[PDB]
Amino acid sequence: KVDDVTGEKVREAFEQFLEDFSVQVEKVYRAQIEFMKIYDLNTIYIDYQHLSMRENGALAMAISEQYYRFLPFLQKGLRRVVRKYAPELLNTSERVFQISFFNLPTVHRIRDIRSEKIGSLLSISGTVTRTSEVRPELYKASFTCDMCRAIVDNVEQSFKYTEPTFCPNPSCENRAFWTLNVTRSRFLDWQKVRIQENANEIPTGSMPRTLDVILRGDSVERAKPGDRCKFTGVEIVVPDVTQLGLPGVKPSSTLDTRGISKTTEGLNSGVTGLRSLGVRDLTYKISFLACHVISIGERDQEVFLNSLSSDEINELKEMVKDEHIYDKLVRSIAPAVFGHEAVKKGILLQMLGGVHKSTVEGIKLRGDINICVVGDPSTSKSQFLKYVVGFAPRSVYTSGKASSAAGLTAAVVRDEEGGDYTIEAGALMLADNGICCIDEFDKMDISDQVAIHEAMEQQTISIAKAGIHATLNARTSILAAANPVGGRYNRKLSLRGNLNMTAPIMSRFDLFFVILDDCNEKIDTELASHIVDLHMKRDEAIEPPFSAEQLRRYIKYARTFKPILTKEARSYLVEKYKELRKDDASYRITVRQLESMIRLSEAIARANCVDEITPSFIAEAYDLLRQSI
Amino acid sequence: RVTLQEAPGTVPPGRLPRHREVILLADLVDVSKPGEEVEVTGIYKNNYDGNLNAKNGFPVFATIIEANSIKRREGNTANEGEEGLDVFSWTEEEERE
Amino acid sequence: KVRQITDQDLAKIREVAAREDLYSLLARSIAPSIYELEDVKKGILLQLFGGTNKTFTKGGRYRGDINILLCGDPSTSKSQILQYVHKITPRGVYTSGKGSSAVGLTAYITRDVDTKQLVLESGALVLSDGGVCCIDEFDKMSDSTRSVLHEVMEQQTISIAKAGIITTLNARSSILASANPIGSRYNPNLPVTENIDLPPPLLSRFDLVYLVLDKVDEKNDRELAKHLTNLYLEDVLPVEFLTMYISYAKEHIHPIITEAAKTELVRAYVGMRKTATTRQLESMIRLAEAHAKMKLKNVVELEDVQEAVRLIRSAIKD
Numbered sequence A: 001k002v003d004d005v006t007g008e009k010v011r012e013a014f015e016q017f018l019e020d021f022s023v024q025v026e027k028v029y030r031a032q033i034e035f036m037k038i039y040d041l042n043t044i045y046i047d048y049q050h051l052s053m054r055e056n057g058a059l060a061m062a063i064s065e066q067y068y069r070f071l072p073f074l075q076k077g078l079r080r081v082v083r084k085y086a087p088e089l090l091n092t093s094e095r096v097f098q099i100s101f102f103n104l105p106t107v108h109r110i111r112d113i114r115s116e117k118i119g120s121l122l123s124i125s126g127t128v129t130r131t132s133e134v135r136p137e138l139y140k141a142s143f144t145c146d147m148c149r150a151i152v153d154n155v156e157q158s159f160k161y162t163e164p165t166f167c168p169n170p171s172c173e174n175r176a177f178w179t180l181n182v183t184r185s186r187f188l189d190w191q192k193v194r195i196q197e198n199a200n201e202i203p204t205g206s207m208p209r210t211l212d213v214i215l216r217g218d219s220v221e222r223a224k225p226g227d228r229c230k231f232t233g234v235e236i237v238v239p240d241v242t243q244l245g246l247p248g249v250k251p252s253s254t255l256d257t258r259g260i261s262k263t264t265e266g267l268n269s270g271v272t273g274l275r276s277l278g279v280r281d282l283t284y285k286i287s288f289l290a291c292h293v294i295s296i297g298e299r300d301q302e303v304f305l306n307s308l309s310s311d312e313i314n315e316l317k318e319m320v321k322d323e324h325i326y327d328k329l330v331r332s333i334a335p336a337v338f339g340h341e342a343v344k345k346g347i348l349l350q351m352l353g354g355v356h357k358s359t360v361e362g363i364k365l366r367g368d369i370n371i372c373v374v375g376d377p378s379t380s381k382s383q384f385l386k387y388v389v390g391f392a393p394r395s396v397y398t399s400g401k402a403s404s405a406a407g408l409t410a411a412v413v414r415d416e417e418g419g420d421y422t423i424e425a426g427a428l429m430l431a432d433n434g435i436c437c438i439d440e441f442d443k444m445d446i447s448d449q450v451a452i453h454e455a456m457e458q459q460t461i462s463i464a465k466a467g468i469h470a471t472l473n474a475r476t477s478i479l480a481a482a483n484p485v486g487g488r489y490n491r492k493l494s495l496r497g498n499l500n501m502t503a504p505i506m507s508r509f510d511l512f513f514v515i516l517d518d519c520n521e522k523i524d525t526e527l528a529s530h531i532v533d534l535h536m537k538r539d540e541a542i543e544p545p546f547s548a549e550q551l552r553r554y555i556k557y558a559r560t561f562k563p564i565l566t567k568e569a570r571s572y573l574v575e576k577y578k579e580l581r582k583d584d585a586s587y588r589i590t591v592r593q594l595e596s597m598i599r600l601s602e603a604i605a606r607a608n609c610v611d612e613i614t615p616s617f618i619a620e621a622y623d624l625l626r627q628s629i
Numbered sequence B: 001r002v003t004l005q006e007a008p009g010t011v012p013p014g015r016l017p018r019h020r021e022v023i024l025l026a027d028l029v030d031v032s033k034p035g036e037e038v039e040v041t042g043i044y045k046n047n048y049d050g051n052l053n054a055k056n057g058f059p060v061f062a063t064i065i066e067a068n069s070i071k072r073r074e075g076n077t078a079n080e081g082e083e084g085l086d087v088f089s090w091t092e093e094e095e096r097e
Numbered sequence C: 001k002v003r004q005i006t007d008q009d010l011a012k013i014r015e016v017a018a019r020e021d022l023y024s025l026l027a028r029s030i031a032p033s034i035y036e037l038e039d040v041k042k043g044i045l046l047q048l049f050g051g052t053n054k055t056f057t058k059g060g061r062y063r064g065d066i067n068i069l070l071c072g073d074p075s076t077s078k079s080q081i082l083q084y085v086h087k088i089t090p091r092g093v094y095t096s097g098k099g100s101s102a103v104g105l106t107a108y109i110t111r112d113v114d115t116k117q118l119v120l121e122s123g124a125l126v127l128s129d130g131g132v133c134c135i136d137e138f139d140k141m142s143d144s145t146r147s148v149l150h151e152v153m154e155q156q157t158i159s160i161a162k163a164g165i166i167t168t169l170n171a172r173s174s175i176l177a178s179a180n181p182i183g184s185r186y187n188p189n190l191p192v193t194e195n196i197d198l199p200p201p202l203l204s205r206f207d208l209v210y211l212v213l214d215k216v217d218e219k220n221d222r223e224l225a226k227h228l229t230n231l232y233l234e235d236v237l238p239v240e241f242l243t244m245y246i247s248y249a250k251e252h253i254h255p256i257i258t259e260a261a262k263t264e265l266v267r268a269y270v271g272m273r274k275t276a277t278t279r280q281l282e283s284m285i286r287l288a289e290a291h292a293k294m295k296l297k298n299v300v301e302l303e304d305v306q307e308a309v310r311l312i313r314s315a316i317k318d
């Protein structure tokens, strides 16, 4: 049989690259193969820059230009390397291996795709707009002769169902009538994703171009719709298999539901002559096959302590030790604003959160803190929302009036590509286990105010219309910003008269914060000076005790704790509830206030990294409740 | 034959659901009703389809589930515990109690 | 059918920038037909450059776009002014706000016509990224689409979550709008709010608001009619220098602030506080840094802050 000579040179060069690189002598690729052996992985990663220094690019350019023809030899050399250095990775519980290339020198756009790079190794960038299911693809087929019962195996398939031709070892003559042994055959994961051009590469007036990218193996589901991803792989061409004689009658010679373009009728150049085609004409289209994908656009203490490094672990425990830590944390929140320390403390308590409990009877007790901040304009109420949405994970930002049909809770919309009713997501739904920052909270629609009557307390949304019936989930905290009715706060009317919310909605907010500015000669100078110290030095203007990352780590570490209540804490709690109820006189104070006080005490306890609750914490929570009523 | 979509609670917020086909044999027909939420134990199988290979352009296969067991979960939050296919059914000693 | 500037262009740009009064020349060049209304042209010339833009890690991005709203009596020449500034700017869109889709200025997931597929089409605010977006007939824009502009002028990003796609785009544009009142005249006695039919926050968030007035004055009426008829009678304005100068100032130049600006700015804000919200000072800073980009410089001084405060107080006068 005819063999290749350049392929052999590439095969030995790849083996030498794998065995010899060692540049960090660490044997980085042998380290990777050992890591695969211990972790039972099925894909290897090869960097282009690492290969870009051996043979002065003679191997790298040879691989890049003719990746399609050189891949079989690369896998063959990898098999020998695996056998020589790690036989355990030669068999499964054989592992079909994959090679992933990345860090290519130059990137291409979708509009640079020409037929003269077909078969070459490229990298492309685009925004994903559709993904499909993970279907199984037939890789190594196995059949049995109908008469002999002889077994054939490892029948390669390119683009269509291919059965063997000439029978195995006897005298039997047979051209067809095989039976696939679906159990013995090997399968692989398969996914098709649609991408389009980026917003900047699109010209002033353009209909965006599209492409079909094929993800296979371990690369499935790594690209999600709406994201911006950089793919790398080989540019291939895909024929029309329907006119290549598919076995079944199901294709029925290109059955169609829509009319094809008359403009390209006869203009699309189709080749004829082949016996399999018959008198038909074969057509081609360009698609992409990707091997590597990148994106360019747990409250358990024991497992948490494992991930962090030793320096981080010691720094965290030294941070915990000091007793002033609490006073520091309230200063680290939003270091780009002046004043409003109470707002910072409230935001920190909200981010820390409270414990969620379930009773034996099955009723759920809420553990989310809701905050409402009100005041007259130009009081930096909208800076806190931006800080939270930038710093808090799984947080969303929204306004009172929403343009979307599912404004804040949910909507029912028919399937765009299916025969069922689906459910869209509102801002409350998109914030499960997260903070929702609502701005201009006054101008909400009444059908939404009544709808939020369930999300704040039961943390669910329940709809029942013609199409679908469901009980959705909204376990989200709410940080709301509102303006007084009439334009300006009045310092003799209460919160109720100045605000517009009803007693149902008003009683579901854990904390109310009224922030007021005053026009005096001296404070205005300080505020102006502070706001203008920026815009000359962007970084040295503000200096907090802790950076963003230290605070982000401390919050995650503190949320692992779950405090309990002591014996005297319960007595102090009931005494304070009784005193508050007496002082109210039942119009504004209910059981929900006691539950909120419990939540605030638990959050304050989480702040100090203590697993027991002291009556001082209940006193602090009581003071915080009294300050807002 | 029935089609099972993913439950809205399970689906990540804002993503499209997925669906699969389930074959119900004798003694299991009409147990599940259109609109209910169900849990099915079964066998996951594959089969060759000409249209699927023709449209996609690769030798991909179709999948389907042959149902073995059916459990209703419409309105049930006690699924955290309990054992069996129906927690509202009783045994002889339970009736005697 | 039907960038890469040369060194000689650089030299001529420098020598023209060395002019004694660059402000007034391009004040008159942008709208040759418009007579008087020099102050609104001053504001538009300052807008077309924009203050410097910055995004530091801790505080986050701070805006550097100037928003201008023109309103007043119904038969002035604001629409021609907008169509003038449309052409000068490199990348911009001129679409009226009378109707169209509620997300017509942002992304709208639509079914493709040629193929039964899905295409994500951006709107007019996204398509004006890095430039000036002109809105006409601002008063007819619907109550539901207005909120979209609210997220554009506050966070400069638009998020779309439909058909399984959840993503965010970038607006980063500047809004110049023109509106009309209710009735045939803007009576000065009644305040602005009733006539313009616009929410107080939307009017407030505009950096500069100009009132165009038309009073029956013999001198002004005769002078207007005279040059109008002279234009109809058949018998110092650069053609494309503005576009190249704008591109040079927008793509290479980034000014800074010095303590000379500190001393004037703090005391000016305090003196204005002798009902000026904190928005006012961040409006003065943007205008001063945009003026600094003009009369080509690399740092702000007293002249820029004086011009900015003069402009923002002449705006207050109306």
Ligand SMILES: Nc1ncnc2c1ncn2[C@@H]1O[C@H](COP(=O)(O)OP(=O)(O)O)[C@@H](O)[C@H]1O
Residues within 6 Å of the ligand: A336, A337, A338, A339, A376, A377, A378, A379, A380, A381, A382, A383, A481, A527, A530, A531, C278, C279, C282
């Ligand atoms: N430390 C501060 N104190 C008061 N105001 C500030 C401070 N820092 C920034 N600001 C101003 O507050 C504005 C934030 O918007 P904001 O007043 O919250 O809008 P709204 O009141 O409509 O929600 C910024 O434009 C900024 O100019």
Ligand SMILES: Nc1ncnc2c1ncn2[C@@H]1O[C@H](COP(=O)(O)OP(=O)(O)O)[C@@H](O)[C@H]1O
Residues within 6 Å of the ligand: C033, C034, C035, C074, C075, C076, C077, C078, C079, C080
């Ligand atoms: N100051 C002015 N200079 C030149 N032409 C003017 C002036 N004021 C009004 N006009 C004339 O009046 C008309 C104004 O129409 P336009 O302003 O476009 O309508 P709208 O009021 O809808 O903006 C123009 O045709 C213009 O010739």
Ligand SMILES: [Zn+2]
Residues within 6 Å of the ligand: A145, A146, A147, A148, A149, A150, A167, A168, A172, A173, A174
């Ligand atoms: Zn045989």
